């Protein structure tokens, strides 16, 4: 519940691969997940391929992967956590917009860990911190480390439901990009320029990029009700074995 690699044996039960070396000597942190490798725990020397391009998100330059993050670099872990929230009892999916509606509005009370892929297969699990508090959520989205406050998401959603109550067409006040890629991601629309007051506009610039990315999955004409995502920890474990 402290390091992102803890879910290897806390969220989902797993063990070392038994071809891993035993650490002898002084303390050194794992290159992935920033977990200190003590004396006696199993570790692997660093054998990343040339296709690994996340050297900028490595926690340390010790060139040693802890066994939990050896499990975390496995391909079934890589496509199993392409969109997943890992609570203290299981791994659930956030692929649907109703699942992100559940995650960023009334979050689960566990100290979870949120990963989401901005591409096909990405190293997501180890390079994000564990969110200890529901109010402050660390979301990994591709090369982006995002922080989402569900209270600010609730305030923006209440603002949007106020300015779009009674109207026939649900027009968004501020445009949000799902990929977080367009220039106008966070830019105020003309309808939102005419239908929001000044302090609401400064609020919509003042939100964090993670809240913008979350609102991108929950600001559209059909509004997703918070529905808990389907539990996928059985699918990941079966794939892992």
């Amino acid at each position: 519940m402290r390091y992102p690699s803890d879910i290897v044996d806390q969220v989902l039960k797993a063990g070392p691969d038994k071809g891993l070396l035993t650490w002898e000597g002084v303390d050194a942190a794992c290159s992935h997940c920033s977990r200190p490798i003590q004396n006696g725990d199993l570790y692997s020397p660093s054998s990343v391929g040339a296709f690994f391009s996340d050297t900028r998100d490595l926690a340390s330059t010790s060139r040693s992967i802890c066994w939990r993050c050896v499990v975390l670099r496995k391909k079934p872990m890589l496509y199993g956590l392409s969109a997943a929230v890992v609570t203290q009892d299981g791994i659930y999916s956030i692929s649907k917009d109703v699942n992100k509606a559940w995650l960023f509005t009334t979050p689960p009370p566990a100290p979870f860990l949120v990963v989401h892929s901005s591409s096909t297969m990405q190293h997501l699990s180890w390079r994000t911190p564990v969110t200890l508090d529901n109010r402050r959520i660390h979301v990994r989205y591709g090369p982006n480390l995002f922080i989402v406050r569900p209270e600010v998401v609730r305030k923006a959603l209440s603002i949007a439901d106020r300015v779009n109550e009674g109207q026939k067409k649900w027009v968004t006040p501020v445009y949000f990009d799902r990929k977080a890629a367009a220039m106008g991601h966070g830019l105020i629309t003309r309808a939102g320029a005419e239908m929001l007051t000044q302090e609401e506009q400064e609020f919509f610039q003042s939100v964090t990029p993670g809240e913008r990315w979350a609102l991108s999955y929950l600001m559209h004409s059909k509004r997703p009700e918070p529905e808990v995502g389907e539990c996928i920890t059985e699918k990941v474990m079966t794939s892992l074995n």
């Binding site: 942190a29 920033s34 200190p36 296709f51 911190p129 508090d133 480390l145 991601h185 964090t208």
Partner: protein
């Protein structure tokens, strides 16, 4: 002297995903000044705690500086910057025939590898940065006059500082606690914005090995 620093800047700044602490900036400027005196062959960690700021001490170890994270008064609406990393494929083939590049591979891969043409989009804000801290004004203005840019991606020229003003302020008028506080921080400094996180409270705030149980607000 219990003072407040405002920074106004010409280009819009690379928007920090996490908190941009004033003590982090002053520690980096002190590291640059230590590189100016004692050369480049130094440990940066011996000097970025030697700052013109007071230190708040938590009850069980875990001190923090009295600086605060920077607040943005956004003069402009937020935009997004695309940048790309591409290795020159044509120049690679020319160097591979000429022998200057010893590459045995015949075909590249934009998916992954040395020729991965990657795209990454990160936020951009023009703002005014306001921070609150308890420190000597002379050393803070010396470090900030040594400062020329603030924010991330400084190698691609983002967010050079047009100017700064450093003035004393009242004790009740400064929230310095809007800052990555320790988990056992004393509750008059822990507001509703502060929440529990795996976060650094000190020094290199990017060093995930130094990330601790922390109570931090959100930019």
């Amino acid at each position: 002297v219990n003072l407040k620093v405002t920074i106004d800047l010409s280009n819009p700044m690379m928007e920090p995903g996490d908190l941009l602490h004033l003590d982090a900036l002053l520690g980096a400027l002190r590291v640059s000044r230590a590189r100016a005196e004692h050369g480049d062959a130094i440990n940066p960690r011996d000097y970025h705690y030697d700052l013109p700021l007071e230190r708040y001490q938590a009850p069980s170890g875990d001190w923090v500086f009295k600086a605060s994270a920077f607040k943005l008064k956004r003069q402009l609406p937020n935009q997004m910057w695309m940048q790309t990393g591409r290795l020159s494929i044509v120049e690679a083939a020319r160097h591979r025939q000429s022998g200057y590049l010893q590459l045995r591979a015949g075909k590249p891969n934009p998916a992954g590898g040395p020729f991965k043409t990657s795209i990454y989009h990160r936020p951009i804000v023009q703002a005014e940065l306001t921070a609150f801290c308890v420190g000597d004004q002379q050393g803070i203005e010396a470090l900030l006059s040594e400062c020329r840019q603030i924010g991330g991606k400084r190698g691609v020229g983002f967010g050079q500082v047009a100017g700064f003003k450093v003035e004393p302020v009242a004790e009740t008028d400064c929230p310095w606690s809007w800052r990555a506080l320790p988990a056992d921080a004393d509750p008059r400094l822990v507001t509703s914005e502060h929440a529990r996180c795996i976060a650094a409270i000190r020094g290199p705030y990017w060093d995930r090995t130094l990330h601790v149980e922390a109570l931090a607000p959100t930019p």
